[PDB]
Design a protein around this ligand. Structure first.
Ligand code: MRZ
Ligand code: CA
Length: 223
């Protein structure tokens, strides 16, 4: 996250870190046994880390649970990033409390102008590299589809939305991928792609979760 603030320990209780020896992507806990992330974060050998603040120090609220299966969306396209969404089942259920909690799925799609919270452990610089260790947060609005399509001609599908600031300076960045965009207490987006980080006229692009609720619910019910 570029241009954000330190969230505070366990203030984003649905945020997870995906670990394969190191943090590589975020995700969101949607019930006691399932996480949603980005398809472009897929790899074998995932440990899900819940209850994290500092990802390099054991602070006492963590739960570390390995994945039993991963399900990439059936129509994910790695060239265009259309349908950039993946479900991860935990080998055992997490123990839910005030510091480790699920986030609700939306029952309607959020409108442009809605303010949302984006979080992650990704790079904090638009030029160069500095990875922060504690969780960072950013408040940002959803942008109109017309603004989004004008920023990225020929690239925005109905399964994507833009959020952030056209003036630049505040955005998600590398290592935030897969993490949550929460608006009015519901998971509306997944950190997906963008050109660089925090550049003028290049806002972040997010997977539009409200289009996937039926697939999520059906998949969980059957796996
Ligand atoms: N929001 C931006 N700029 N991103 C998404 C996360 C990876 C880098 C590009
Ligand atoms: Ca920790």
């Amino acid at each position: 996250i570029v241009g954000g603030y330190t969230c505070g320990a366990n203030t984003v209780p649905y945020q997870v870190s995906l670990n394969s020896g190191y943090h590589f992507c975020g995700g969101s806990l949607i019930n006691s046994q399932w996480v949603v992330s980005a398809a472009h974060c897929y790899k074998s050998g995932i440990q899900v880390r819940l209850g994290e603040d500092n990802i390099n120090v054991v602070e006492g609220n963590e739960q570390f649970i390995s994945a039993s299966k991963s399900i990439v969306h059936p129509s994910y396209n790695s060239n265009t990033l259309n349908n950039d969404i993946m479900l991860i089942k935990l080998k055992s259920a997490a123990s839910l409390n005030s510091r480790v909690a699920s986030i609700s799925l939306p029952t309607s799609c959020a409108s442009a102008g809605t303010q949302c919270l984006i979080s992650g452990w990704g790079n904090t610089k638009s030029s160069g590299t500095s990875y922060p260790d504690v969780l960072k947060c950013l408040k940002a609005p959803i942008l109109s589809d017309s603004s989004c399509k004008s920023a990225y001609p020929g690239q925005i599908t109905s399964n994507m939305f833009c959020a952030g600031y056209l003036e630049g300076g505040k955005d998600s960045c590398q290592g935030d991928s897969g993490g949550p965009v929460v608006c009015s207490g519901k998971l509306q987006g997944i950190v997906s792609w963008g050109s660089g980080c925090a550049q003028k006229n290049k806002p972040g692009v997010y997977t539009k979760v409200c289009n996937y609720v039926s697939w999520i619910k059906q998949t969980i019910a059957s796996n």
